[PDB]
Amino acid sequence: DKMNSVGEACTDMKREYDQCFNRWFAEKFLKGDSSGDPCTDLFKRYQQCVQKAIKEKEIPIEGLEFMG
Amino acid sequence: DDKMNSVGEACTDMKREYDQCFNRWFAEKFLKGDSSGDPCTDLFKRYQQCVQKAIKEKEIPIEGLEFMGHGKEK
Amino acid sequence: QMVKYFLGQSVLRSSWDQVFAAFWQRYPNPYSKHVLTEDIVHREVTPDQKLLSRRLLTVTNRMPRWAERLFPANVAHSVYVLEDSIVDPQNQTMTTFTWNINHARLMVVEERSVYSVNSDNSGWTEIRREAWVSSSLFGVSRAVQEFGLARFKSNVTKTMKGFEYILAKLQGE
Amino acid sequence: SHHHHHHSDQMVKYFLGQSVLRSSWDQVFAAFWQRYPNPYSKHVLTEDIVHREVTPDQKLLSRRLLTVTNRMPRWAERLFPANVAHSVYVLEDSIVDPQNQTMTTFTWNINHARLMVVEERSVYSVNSDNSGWTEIRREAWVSSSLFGVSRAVQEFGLARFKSNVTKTMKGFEYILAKLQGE
């Protein structure tokens, strides 16, 4: 069931942000913009952890232009 | 000193006299007309039977190729 | 020709609503045995209500038994692939762009996909893709060719020099 | 007159060049087996004759084997570190026709075949402009196996993309089945 992540530290962690984001995505983003995003308080914690794990693996990302 | 080395490091010795033989041959009476006699064959067979040893022991892939580009054209 | 180009059209039978939400829930699944990690490394929301999102994800490397031989360099390294997703519901469309960020040397494959509602059926969702497979290895083989003729061109000049020289040494002993 | 040119033929390079030596034909044929060594030959190391014989028609068929220094440019040791170790071995076959006063030579490398192959067919013939001079015609082809692989690496890269795209679609329909109930 669990997919894993580049940072093993934050595998279960994503699984929390994930289930949040879908409920948010599916319930009140396609239906209509509604209110703002609640997962940001979890997402901030997740992104920092992930950035750390990529520098550990020296994963390229030279801030590349969006869509290449 | 002046002459050219060889692949069989031994046969350099055996090489350079056959070479000078052949030139004296080539120029005097092959290029100029017909002489019809080759005094260098005798020495050639020892010379090159010595490199035929050499090319196997250094495994250079001469065998399997044919004259001109019929063997390997590009 | 230089870079290969692929154009594919498919449709899968489910609401535009229902696939866009499946798009983030596909991993794992039985067929994606080869995907290993997936991460959402950036995700913003615009003023036009669009979900900009960058998802990196590592995939196992699987090469044919001749390639490892010629490229031992990159066999025990996996492939990092990046995916850029913009999601538009106001228009009911989503476009993604995806490509490897390592193994760049020997190949870059990169995909612009578009997901929209099927034209002749409105309970379904058409998918367009265009591919560009390239490889920096063409430029290389050019370099090896250009270097090899230049060497040959100089080495022919040397022959004439060495030929003229020893010709001179033979005249009049 | 002295001149040359080269242009890409197919996906290989063709070179054509013409040169004339200011000596008689017999001397150059005789000097062709002597040129090594010389001050400009510093790259050749050995020279041998691995096969020679006299035909019925009074031509001399010779095959000589040189081994020459392989100095590549420094970006190319990085990419092909396997090749830096080995000296190039070259075979050029030759036939000499005394009656027609012409000699032809074919030369190409027989190792580094996977990296690059250069082949040269030169013909030495008596000049028509002067008649105390030798005219040399030489054409050449530089090829590389790397072009082929660049295509293989592309063909395989495309293949694996197509298989990977079915697996996304046939993995997509499946998640859709698990949410639809199913």
Author numbering:
A (entry chain H): 12 to 79
B (entry chain A): 11 to 84
C (entry chain C): 11 to 183
D (entry chain F): 2 to 183
Give me lines lifted from the publication on this model:
TRIAP1 (yeast Mdm35) and PRELI (yeast Ups) proteins reside within the IMS where they regulate phospholipid metabolism.
We reasoned that the mutation of the critical K58 residue in PRELID1, which promoted PS transfer, would allow phospholipid exchange and subsequent crystallisation of a PS-bound ligand. A molecule of PS was modelled into the omit map observed, and this was further refined with ligand occupancy set to 0.3 in accordance with lipidomics analysis for the PS molecule. The PS molecule docked in the observed electron density was found enclosed within the cavity of PRELID1–K58V with the serine group positioned at the bottom of the pocket and the acyl chain pointing towards the entrance of the pocket. The smaller V58 side-chain of the mutant now allows the phosphodiester linkage to pass comfortably through and extend deeper into the cavity and the acyl chains of PS occupy the same channels as for PA. Interestingly, in the PA-bound Ups1 structure, additional space was observed beyond the phosphate deeper into the cavity and in our PS-bound PRELID1 mutant this is now occupied by the serine group from PS.
